[PDB]
Chain A
């Protein structure tokens, strides 16, 4: 299992996507609600608001609201989910808000690359804040 406590969003997603595609057992991202998204507050909120309200009702883009749904969607883009390889990879990913009971006390590991300590300044927001600004109870 992978703990998303204080990790960059795209860096984490890229690493997880590649080592899903390499072919192994399934992976678990827990605490997927305090992942970091570097960038100023206003710009992040603006971009996510425009992403949220963009579709048409019958067939438009249905961007999710829940935090783990957002993280799953972010990983979904770095992956050929229309092919068979990509669909099989998407079948082996499980991102949880908080800690599920069955993964309680499980052994964890982290991506040493995606670390908020590796950031120049203090210009970032946490994923749960954007989730609540988009109107989600988690």
Chain B
């Protein structure tokens, strides 16, 4: 039979397609440290989109030296608190948590997520970790941070979000010293990312609920005379005669949306401090207006408004150091009508 070849419908690199087990994106891989100690991640909340007019400066690009319009996503980033230090041990069966020390001072609203740890061992526990590193058992150190969404207004929740980050250094002793220095303090977004650099974004995407094969995998409808015979948006065949089973690679209906996704090489265009420079007339739709400091990201970002966005320094970047963008105009038109 003279068959006409067609690429497979949809991608099997994301299966099974089920609801994310949490509302907070989790990072599986941390980059390699190539500089002084610092955190490798940050968190914020998505607001909406605008566009800016910036003098093009991408090297070797066609549109170099002339004005362009770019879509940007505005992200609110109130300062985070470093609440704990965690130590990991390496063996045959991979890393294993072996110690944690919490900060003495914490926010009273953290009681909504977990009961507040009490100030027991602080100096003795830290020196315990130091002795462990001194006897060459500890391999790496990670920091535990949370957000403080009570300062914002467009986000209804008042309970913090807890997650683990990574410190970037060239030695375990340096990581431990830096973690001791920064433990139990507030870290601003400027201390993590420099303006003009690239980042990686993770977030839970918008949920569409249960969807059929056509909208879930993008299969073809029924064409022509077949479009009015009873099956229009159903799949053609569920399999062959043999094997006598339906393969897992056949398109079917189920959950669509609310998965975890990652975007690569998004550029940071502006680190702001005052919210009046991005707020349109009438505020953003369904959000309100910006009150704290923010950040502008070139392009789009996964997830809807009022969703938590995690950021980490690039893991597969190609291009060399880019530079500070030259923003000329930031659109503050009404998003409404």
Contact, CB under 8 Å: A138 / B92: yes
CA distance A97 to B248 in the complex (A): 35
CA distance A57 to B249 in the complex (A): 11
Closest B residue to A138 using CB positions: B92
Taking the nearest CB of chain A, how far is it from the CB of B39, in angstroms? 27
CA distance A97 to B93 in the complex (A): 9
**A25 part of interface (Cβ distance < 8 Å):** no
Prevailing SS type, chain A contact patch: loop
**A98 part of interface (Cβ distance < 8 Å):** yes
CA distance A57 to B248 in the complex (A): 9
Contact, CB under 8 Å: A58 / B248: yes
CA distance A98 to B248 in the complex (A): 39
CA distance A88 to B248 in the complex (A): 35
Which B residues touch A57, using CB under 8 A? 248
Taking the nearest CB of chain B, how far is it from the CB of A82, in angstroms? 24
Closest A residue to B92 using CB positions: A97
Taking the nearest CB of chain B, how far is it from the CB of A9, in angstroms? 20
CA distance A99 to B92 in the complex (A): 10
CA distance A58 to B249 in the complex (A): 11
Which A residues touch B92, using CB under 8 A? 97-98, 138
Per-residue CB contact flags for chain B residues 83-100 toward chain A (1 = under 8 Å, else 0) read 000000000100000000
Closest B residue to A98 using CB positions: B92
Taking the nearest CB of chain B, how far is it from the CB of A21, in angstroms? 29
Taking the nearest CB of chain A, how far is it from the CB of B309, in angstroms? 32
Per-residue CB contact flags for chain B residues 230-253 toward chain A (1 = under 8 Å, else 0) read 000000000000000000100000
CA distance A58 to B248 in the complex (A): 8
- Could you list 5 examples of A-B contacts with CB < 8 Å? A57-B248, A58-B248, A97-B92, A98-B92, A138-B92
> Footprint of A on B, CB under 8 Å?
92, 248
> Footprint of B on A, CB under 8 Å?
57-58, 97-98, 138
